[PDB]
Paper text:
XopAI, encoded by XAC3230 in Xac, is a putative type III effector composed of 296 amino acids. XopAI resembles a bent right hand, and it can be dissected as a two-lobe structure with an N-terminal α-helical lobe (residues 74 to 193), and a C-terminal β-sandwich lobe (residues 194 to 296). XopAI possesses a highly negatively charged surface at its central cleft, whereas a positively charged surface is required for interacting electrostatically with the negatively charged phosphate group of NAD+ in mARTs. From analyses of the crystal packing, we found that XopAI uses an altered mART domain to bind its own N-terminal peptide containing a conserved Arg residue.
However, the P41212 crystals diffract to a resolution of 1.53 Å and the structure was solved via molecular replacement. Similarly, the first 58 residues of XopAI in the P41212 crystals were not built in the model. For the protein interaction mode found in the P41212 crystals, the central cleft binds residues 59 to 70 from an adjacent protein, and it has an interface area of 673 Å2. In the P41212 crystals, the backbone of the Arg peptide adopts a “W”-shaped conformation in the central cleft. The N-terminus of Arg peptide is placed at the left side of the central cleft, whereas the C-terminus protrudes out of the middle of the cleft. In the P41212 crystals, the residues of the N- and C-termini interact with the PN loop. In the P41212 mode, the backbone oxygen atoms from residues W154 and T156 form three obvious hydrogen bonds with the R62* guanidinium group. The bound R62* in the P41212 mode did not change drastically in conformation through the entire simulation. The loop structure found in the P41212 peptide-bound state is in a stretched conformation, whereas that in the monomer D of the ΔN70 crystal structure is in a contracted conformation. For example, the central cleft in the P41212 peptide-bound state has a volume of 722 Å3; however, that in the monomer D of the ΔN70 crystal structure has a volume of 159 Å3.
Author numbering: 58 to 296
The structure:
């Protein structure tokens, strides 16, 4: 009888055996592929995760933020009828991905990551959004990424002539803009179904393409340099 809605309007996140939850989610991602979809219950869990992400004292502010994102995305579905089958909370997840909230979810399905309930809830709605966006949101072209990862991080995940099944939310840009920092690792990735999320982003001047965990890349070449980029990865998305 605890936490009735008039006293506690957010559903509590499932905190039991997070390692098992992460294993079950990764199995589902691989099995469901492009048919992965968040359930109504998972969308409500994602609502709790987002509103509570900063702790109790920020829930009133983050509730207002949540309401504003929901309104923006409901309006977006109306103004862009190709999106009318999207779940509003899945679109909100794409907007949330483009905020600083991304750190809770980017790596949550990595084998060695410590999972959190918040990250797992975010992940389900982002993955659902990416696989439910219509095909006109897919980008066909080379997309660009830079990250400050260590050499062993790269070699644990990418090998020339091998297929990487990426467990990360892997972000890239359609454009290779000048940047203030030369990154330790760069990628050139050929996208076939990577999804353009600029329409949903909080940084509308960006042209971000986002791949979900489970994306497969044929790694064709890894270049080494003595200075940045220490590693440059050339890879191509495959079915």
């Amino acid at each position: 009888s605890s936490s009735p809605r008039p006293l506690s309007p957010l559903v509590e996140l499932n905190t039991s055996d997070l390692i098992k939850q992460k294993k079950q989610l990764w199995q589902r991602v691989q099995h469901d592929g492009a048919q992965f979809r968040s359930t109504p219950e998972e969308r409500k869990q994602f609502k709790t995760a987002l509103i509570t992400l900063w702790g109790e004292q920020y829930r009133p502010e983050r509730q207002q933020r949540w309401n504003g994102m929901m309104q923006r995305m409901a309006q977006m579905k109306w103004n862009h009828p190709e999106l009318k089958y999207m779940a509003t909370e899945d679109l909100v997840a794409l907007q949330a991905w483009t905020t600083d909230d991304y750190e809770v979810v980017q790596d949550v399905l990595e084998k060695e990551a410590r999972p959190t309930a918040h990250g797992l809830a975010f992940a389900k709605c982002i993955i659902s959004a990416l696989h439910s966006l219509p095909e006109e949101y897919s980008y066909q072209g080379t997309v660009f990424t830079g990250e400050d990862q260590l050499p062993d991080w790269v070699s644990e995940r990418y090998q020339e002539r091998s297929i990487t099944t990426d467990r990360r939310f892997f972000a890239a840009s359609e454009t290779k803009n000048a940047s203030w920092q030369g990154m330790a690792v760069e990628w050139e990735s050929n996208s076939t179904t990577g999804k353009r999320i600029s329409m949903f982003s909080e940084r509308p001047n960006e042209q971000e393409v986002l791949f979900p965990p489970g994306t497969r890349f044929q790694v064709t070449r890894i270049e080494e340099n003595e200075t940045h980029p220490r590693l440059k990865i050339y890879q191509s998305q495959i079915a």
